[PDB]
Amino acid sequence: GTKFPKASQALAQDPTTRRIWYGIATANDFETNDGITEENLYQKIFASHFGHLAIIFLWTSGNLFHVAWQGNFEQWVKDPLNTRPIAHAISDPHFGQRAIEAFSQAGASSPVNISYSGVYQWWYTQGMRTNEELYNGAIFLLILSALSLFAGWLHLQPKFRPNLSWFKNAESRLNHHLGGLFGTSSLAWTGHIVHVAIPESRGQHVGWDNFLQVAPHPAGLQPFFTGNWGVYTENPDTANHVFGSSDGAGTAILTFLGGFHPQTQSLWLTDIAHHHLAIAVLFIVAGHMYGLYDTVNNSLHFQLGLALAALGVITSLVAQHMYSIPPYAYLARDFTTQAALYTHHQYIAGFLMVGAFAHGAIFLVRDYDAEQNKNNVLARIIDHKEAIISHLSWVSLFLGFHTLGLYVHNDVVQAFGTPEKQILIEPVFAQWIQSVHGKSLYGFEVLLNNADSITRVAPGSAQPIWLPGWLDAINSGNNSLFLTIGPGDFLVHHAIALGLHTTTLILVKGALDARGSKLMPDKKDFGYSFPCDGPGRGGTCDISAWDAFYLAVFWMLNTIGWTTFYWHWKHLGVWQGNVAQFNESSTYLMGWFRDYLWLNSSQLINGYNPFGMNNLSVWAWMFLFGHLIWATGFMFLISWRGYWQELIETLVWAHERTPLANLVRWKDKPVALSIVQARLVGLAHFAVGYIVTYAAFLIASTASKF
Amino acid sequence: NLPSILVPMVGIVLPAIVMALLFVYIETDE
Amino acid sequence: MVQRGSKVRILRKESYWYQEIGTVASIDQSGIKYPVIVRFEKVNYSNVNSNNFSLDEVVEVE
Amino acid sequence: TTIKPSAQVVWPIVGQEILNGDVGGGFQGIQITSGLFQMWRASGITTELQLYVTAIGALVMAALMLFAGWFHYHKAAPKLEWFQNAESMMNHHLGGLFGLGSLSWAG
Amino acid sequence: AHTVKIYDTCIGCTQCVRACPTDVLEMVPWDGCRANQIASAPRTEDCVGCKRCESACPTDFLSIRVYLGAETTRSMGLGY
Amino acid sequence: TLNLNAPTPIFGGSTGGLLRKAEVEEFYSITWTGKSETVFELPTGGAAIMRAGENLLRLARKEQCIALGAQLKDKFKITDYKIYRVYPSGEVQFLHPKDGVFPEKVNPGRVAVGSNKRRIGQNPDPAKLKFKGQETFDS
Amino acid sequence: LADGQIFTALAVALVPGILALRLALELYK
Amino acid sequence: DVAGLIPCSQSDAFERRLKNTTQRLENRLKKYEPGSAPAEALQKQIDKTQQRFDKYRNSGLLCGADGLPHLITDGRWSHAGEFTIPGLLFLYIAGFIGWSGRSYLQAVAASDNSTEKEIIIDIPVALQSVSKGFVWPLAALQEFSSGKLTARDEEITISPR
Amino acid sequence: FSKYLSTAPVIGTLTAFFLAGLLIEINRFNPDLLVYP
Ligand code: CLA
Ligand code: CLA
């Protein structure tokens, strides 16, 4: 009968330690707050969003303030090809003389980090040149974070609290965001490219002190109204042009060169601007157009579960398109920085997609009404529900037996001294597509390997001018634009498919079995996350919808891991110009053990040793740190509540019976973590361990050999 | 002269108070 | 009405053998609700074979 | 000293016969780590023939114990009070099994 | 405390009552025939939620169901 | 009535019994009349001895009192085990049998509380009770 | 950078420093 | 030349693997007595390797830059021998045991102890389903066209909604 | 005994004894079968 926790009234009467844990676990779980109403819920969400908004801005301000103060951007802009970007200083009192001596690196005198987020390459392209331009963004974001905070506070006050109808006006939000949020922002970013970014890449300084005076083009805005848009197709930059300075600089602000800049190996600024200007137009027009709509509007989980499903899709795209299409100068050449950005965003994509299906299952338990959803599209998947899972179950089984089978087949015959007996399947359907995209390496000789096809010529309106720049790049093996593939790429791609199929099955089944099955017809009555249904009826562990999300988090990490494992190993050879090592060893699993894990861990594992230490001791310590916390998760997942609760009782007895200690007492009675709690806590250790093992290895292995 | 004071305030001094405030908030009642 | 020896299919969807056939041993001939006892070749998750079912939950395919 | 032991020569199929690698002498096989070669050398076994009877003596004693599991249950299985005679069991296992069984090995 | 509900599909077998380790349940006369009996829960404050009860019901889709709720000293099984 | 005091068994032990939960709130007392001087397993450790009695044992949980008398029913046929809950440092005296007869035997005059007039296949979805203080299985 | 611009940054950080103290109280309220 | 692959007759690194394996066996053979049972195992291990290389040299296979033969499947009938006829060879025998279990269980489940003959499987009906398994691609066409390869969804156990 | 040979494990091992031994001889007889000619 204590005041804490406020949001959960029932928890507040629990006299044990469970109260504190669950009071944290049910705090921001607003849908089960005591005495809550729908109108208060929506107004609270809006304000909560501002807090997140402020944090992202502060984070980027923290990404700005520390670089301007302790980084080396001004030093970096001068010759990016050898300077290591500095994240921030190292102020750790436990450091010794020899640890300061090792991390005083990147040409610094005090210890600092070597940054790998790529913000230096991104900010350069955007037009930032000096540390003081950095200092402006952090200060500006500080106000914007406080302005979002004030606004969140503002829209919670009586006179400014919105009504319910405003929050549920779905069509207007899409219209206003593709109008505003998408339309106006993309068009303006083309403007920031042409009014700021492009001049600075051509040696011309444009700042607040002069931006109103210097125009982006010699005689612009007289052709603009008269329809003579073609004047902006004036003289681009020559192949001899040196990025960031005026030796070879042109005057174009809108182009369609295609390919990559020969020096930077990244997109043309003028090319990025036209793309954003064009997409902007598309969203502004579509944003002026406005039974399932009555269902997607009343469930906050359905909207979010699609919003993560949209976020999860485009997060994967960001990883796929940034490694093959580098958009920032020299970002293709900073290989560790190429490695961190791909892995990071791919893991995020896995969480959102898994999360999308997780919140979908919550919708099915608390909001899906069988009688307001009848004879529509939603309830017709529930109709043949047993069919979808059963077929999906088969494909996973099918994929697994054969994909593992081919790898083991190759391994054995290779183990016996006979590599020629391996089963190596050429990715001919894939090799078709690159050849259809213009890659004349595989020689399939149709569709822009065909020099006369109507696609390459485009006899309609003489449009196709991305083609020269593109064809040069697709045949040169100096980038990652449609990388060469062989037997290794075939097997992994089917493994990834196997990973995508097994991960999707559990998440779809979890949502589809959330409301009920034969083993548990009334599952919906117990809510989303509950322990089980006892040892009766054969046993019911891991029967809750939450547990399905929980098991799937193990499968996604494996899937997203295999993708990042594949992407990493392949890139090692290309960056070291010896693609042959990977091509022959990646078709059997011992190669991934000998030439990928063991081989690339040589330096990382020697970050410190009995003879000294180097600048990789953190990564070496973190690697071991990750292994420990990964393994710590196994403890909570294998040993369950009962064992611990009985163990705790002997400690409670011992404390109360020990003089000089008996005198003091706990306020909350000690109890073991809950059944669901342990799964989450175990998985959290496991997953953090999964990443911080991979983060330590990925960064350290590449930073030592380049 | 700036981080040498600041990091043992945020890492040491700050959790000594914000867990002290969040000890008297978890274990008090109405 | 469903007799004794009556091979019936469950319409009560909460049953494990919903949309499956078993024969009726008997019903209760009293004023109680839920009288029908049905036996199946498949066993449920607690490995039993019967319940007091009702007659608005069965069909008479024979 | 130099020659490592090897038993289990592998059959000539796909390349599992490459496990029959050069061990020393005119013999090729899987290097055994069971220590039977250093065990039998102390026991004095110098020709393959002496061992040959043994496996036979290990087969016929396997048949004798399997018949004794038959005979002492299918025909003549003892009383409960024959099992609760612990002191006569402790006397015999100490004296006969560990005592004479090491006395005979001392012989 | 935990919630223990008893539905009208009870066949008066009395197994559940005798399965409960803390004596939370008891049989009471059914009025639809005055010959059947149904279980009743006068001591829900002692239910630990072990679910031993639900395992004892023979009926194909149990008549007594235990939905775990707010925890207290009694329900958490503490000797302390 | 508990008639305290009553003779405790001849036990002498149990680190596994009755620490500072009891003296602040809610401990227990089983009572029976054991028809021998046998030895029996306690829930804390196991052996005390049953008296002729007036037997009495102060336990910690109502769970612990029940599994004692189920053994008294199975292994000793002592049907007279009468469990309690103490005065001021406990709550409600004489919980079992609350109606004078055994709870596996049916007694009229008891109240059908929790008795539900529907099936569980006829259970509503929480969308018909959403944002409402009604609970999905209530009645 | 400079030494003085660092403290002007730390002086304008109090403008987030009072509203989050108010908004989290307001999100609690 | 389906993806730049050169044939194994004119693959130069593929014929290099044959000069690399027996030389490792020749180092294994120079040290031994050339009449010993190691050496009769050392002349075999060359020649069992040899006819494998003279199988893939002669098959018109497409070896890669590694010197190793690869498999092509878009299925054309120039490269049908990689996947198609070794693949449908699985499919014929898979429906054989597939029409064993489809046909064994419908009769035996109409018995008194219908499940002990899943434990103690009768040697009559199993070898019949060996004979009934050989007619698997033809027999199921009059099953589905009559409808007795599936059921209606009022006959099948289906999880609640 | 012959009915004991009709129970599930012995019939699942002796049938596995035969078809596996088919592949032992035919991979000694016809070695290294990647492709059909
Ligand atoms: C032998 C009778 C038999 C038949 C005709 C089927 C038929 C089917 N199974 Mg099932 N299944 C069976 C037994 C059978 N199963 C057994 C014994 C197991 C445990 C190993 C499974 C586990 C299983 C899973 C996990 C899945 C299926 C699926 C399927 C469907 C797709 C085909 C497939 O890929 O199978 C799958 C093949 C396997 C899992 C491997 C082979 C299974 C065993 C080892 C075959 C053993 C045969 C036995 C030795 C024969 C006895 C001889 C005697 C009859 C004379 C199809 C309806 C899938 C589905 O749902 O499709 C929609 C699916 O995901 N089955
Ligand atoms: C059934 C499981 C399955 C799944 C999920 C995938 C998924 C994929 N395949 Mg794979 N593939 C499969 C089976 C599968 N394949 C089979 C059986 C073969 C022939 C051995 C291949 C041969 C193959 C090649 C050569 C390539 C891919 C590629 C891909 C990827 C891109 C899509 C594509 O090109 O599809 C193509 C569509 C298909 C192959 C048809 C779908 C598979 C059907 C359902 C299998 C049915 C088997 C059939 C009954 C066997 C009878 C043979 C007989 C007719 C002769 C994608 C991950 C490409 C890639 O790696 O891109 C990066 C690529 O180049 N696949």
Ligand code: CLA
């Ligand atoms: C299930 C886990 C769990 C959790 C989360 C809690 C939580 C709590 N316990 Mg309880 N308790 C538990 C189980 C638990 N308990 C168990 C199993 C026992 C033994 C039976 C106790 C016995 C107990 C007693 C006697 C007391 C608590 C108290 C507390 C409260 C204060 C935290 C504390 O005093 O830790 C103390 C921390 C430690 C013992 C860790 C050792 C610290 C060493 C010396 C190193 C730290 C020194 C270092 C310099 C750190 C300085 C950092 C700074 C510079 C930033 C907190 C609510 C207190 C309370 O309730 O007040 C009324 C209290 O008096 N607990």
Ligand code: CLA
């Ligand atoms: C928001 C992201 C962010 C992050 C992760 C960091 C991280 C760090 N800062 Mg930096 N800092 C930031 C923003 C950030 N800062 C901003 C916006 C400013 C200008 C106001 C500063 C001004 C600053 C100075 C002067 C110094 C640091 C220092 C440091 C380092 C040691 C810790 C410390 O003393 O902080 C002190 C932090 C401040 C004085 C201001 C922080 C203001 C941000 C917005 C707070 C964000 C809080 C975050 C959301 C809380 C989440 C946890 C909580 C909910 C439990 C550490 C690397 C020290 C250093 O450089 O060591 C080498 C140091 O001397 N920071």
Ligand SMILES: CC1=C(/C=C/C(C)=C/C=C/C(C)=C\C=C\C=C(C)\C=C\C=C(C)\C=C\C2=C(C)CCCC2(C)C)C(C)(C)CCC1
């Ligand atoms: C051509 C080709 C190809 C492809 C293939 C494919 C694509 C296929 C698919 C497939 C399909 C698309 C088909 C359809 C199907 C569907 C369904 C619907 C199915 C079902 C099935 C069933 C129904 C079965 C039955 C049976 C039998 C038959 C026997 C046994 C029993 C059973 C019942 C199981 C490849 C490249 C590889 C190679 C080359 C050529």
Ligand code: SF4
């Ligand atoms: S404790 Fe775990 S295993 Fe036991 S019934 Fe609950 S969920 Fe199942």
